Amino acid sequence: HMKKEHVLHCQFSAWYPFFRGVTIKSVILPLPQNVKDYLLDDGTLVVSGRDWSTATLTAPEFPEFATKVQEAINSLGGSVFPKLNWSAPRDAYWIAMNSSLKCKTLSDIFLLFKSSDFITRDFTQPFIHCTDDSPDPCIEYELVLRKWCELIPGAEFRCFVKENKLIGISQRDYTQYYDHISKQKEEIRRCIQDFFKKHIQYKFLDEDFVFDIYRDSRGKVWLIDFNPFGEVTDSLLFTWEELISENNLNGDFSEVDAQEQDSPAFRCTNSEYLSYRLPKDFDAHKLIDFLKLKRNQQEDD
Amino acid sequence: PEIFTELEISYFLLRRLLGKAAKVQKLSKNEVLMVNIGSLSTGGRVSAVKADLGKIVLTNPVCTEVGEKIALSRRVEKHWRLIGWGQIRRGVTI
Numbered sequence: 001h002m003k004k005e006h007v008l009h010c011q012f013s014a015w016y017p018f019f020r021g022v023t024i025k026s027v028i029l030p031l032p033q034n035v036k037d038y039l040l041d042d043g044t045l046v047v048s049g050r051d052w053s054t055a056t057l058t059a060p061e062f063p064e065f066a067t068k069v070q071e072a073i074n075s076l077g078g079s080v081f082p083k084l085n086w087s088a089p090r091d092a093y094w095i096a097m098n099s100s101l102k103c104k105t106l107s108d109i110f111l112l113f114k115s116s117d118f119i120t121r122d123f124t125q126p127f128i129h130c131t132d133d134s135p136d137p138c139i140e141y142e143l144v145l146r147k148w149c150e151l152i153p154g155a156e157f158r159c160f161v162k163e164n165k166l167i168g169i170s171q172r173d174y175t176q177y178y179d180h181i182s183k184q185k186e187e188i189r190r191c192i193q194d195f196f197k198k199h200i201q202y203k204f205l206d207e208d209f210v211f212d213i214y215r216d217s218r219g220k221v222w223l224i225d226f227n228p229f230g231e232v233t234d235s236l237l238f239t240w241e242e243l244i245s246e247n248n249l250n251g252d253f254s255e256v257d258a259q260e261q262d263s264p265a266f267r268c269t270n271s272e273y274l275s276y277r278l279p280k281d282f283d284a285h286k287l288i289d290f291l292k293l294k295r296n297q298q299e300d301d
Numbered sequence: 302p303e304i305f306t307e308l309e310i311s312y313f314l315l316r317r318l319l320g321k322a323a324k325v326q327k328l329s330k331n332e333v334l335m336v337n338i339g340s341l342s343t344g345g346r347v348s349a350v351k352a353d354l355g356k357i358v359l360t361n362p363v364c365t366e367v368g369e370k371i372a373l374s375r376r377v378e379k380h381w382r383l384i385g386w387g388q389i390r391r392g393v394t395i
């Protein structure tokens with residue numbers, strides 16, 4: 001029962017003023033109309049402001065917006081992590097230099113955004129999985145420039161809240177094992193409960209929501225983002241069938257392993273993303289063999 | 302095997318897209334294509350075009366070798382769509 005109002009509350013500019021002191025320093029720039037049209041181009045990719053023996057494509061140039069973005073990047077230290085209203089171009093990592101989302105110019109942001117389907121989803125499918133009959137609100141799209149941080153791998157956790165109650169914590173990179181998570185399992189559990197109780201509980205715009213956190217090298221918990229309490233958010237080591245059910249998410253355990261019941265369920269990966277860099281059509285040997293066959297058939301058709 | 306920043310390739314484009322699907326446009330300079338090389342992907346900015354040959358300036362240098370076959374995709378309606386394949390003939394290494 002996720003409504004379109006819940007998606008609006010998870011926009012960056014909606015919650016950042018209220019949680020500024022517990023998250024990463026960021027700058028929010030309104031997206032100009034012509035810049036929005038550029039990112040929505042249905043043709044081939046040409047990057048804007050990049051500076052033997054056929055057509056030469058040129059992208060639109062936005063001088064006033066490029067200097068505005070560059071001034072915000074300099075105010076954050078010269079390196080930024082770009083997002084839109086909700087999403088980051090996490091699926092366009094392969095195309096950027098050194099496979100990094102760190103951006104120093106507007107051109108770096110353009111190359112990521114126009115190569116990312118998560119960004120395209122923010123424009124074209126913002127209110128998916130919503131169940132209310134209300135008409136789609138008008139979105140005012142914005143560029144979010146977040147100060148770049150060198151995060152430690154295996155220190156990010158997704159937290160699920162239902163009726164202002166923290167009902168579960170999940171490791172965010174749930175497909176990768178990290179040894180230090182299970183050794184610090186109880187200390188992480190306590191620091192996220194204290195953070196939520198002091199800084200998150202009763203302060204977000206909804207009862208049911210999801211929020212991601214990062215625990216730095218000194219043990220301090222930082223806020224990363226707010227996500228909708230619905231199918232649009234990956235439940236990671238949890239399933240939404242048991243998160244809505246409000247059941248005993250801790251599971252079957254003995255009294256020698258179980259802690260207090262007030263604590264939520266904490267799941268991490270025990271001892272044991274790919275379609276991002278592939279096309280929508282998606283072993284490269286069989287793929288090109290399949291390309292030769294289809295090209296010969298299209299010559300006949 | 303080395304690390305290449307530019308690639309000289311021989312390419313073959315499909316007549317139309319997969320999945321009456323739309324035709325495939327010819328390669329144009331300064332367009333960025335998605336390049337699938339083995340087990341990794343990268344971007345390729347078209348810098349020179351001939352009937353069967355071409356040069357792409359990689360947005361991110363990869364490790365490959367002369368003779369390895371590649372896959373090419375083009376941004377079509379905000380989706381990466383396969384348009385053809387190529388094979389490396391020459392490369393600029395760093």
Ligand SMILES: Nc1ncnc2c1ncn2[C@@H]1O[C@H](COP(=O)(O)OP(=O)(O)OP(=O)(O)O)[C@@H](O)[C@H]1O
Binds near residue numbers: 224
């Ligand atoms: N300021 C930053 N600097 C560097 N890396 C960052 C920064 N903020 C986030 N990251 C990294 O990028 C990842 C994605 O960040 P974020 O949570 O903002 O993405 P999102 O687009 O909202 O994704 P999701 O689909 O999970 O909601 C984080 O898990 C973290 O590893």
Ligand SMILES: [Mg+2]
Binds near residue numbers: 086225226227
């Ligand atoms: Mg998020």
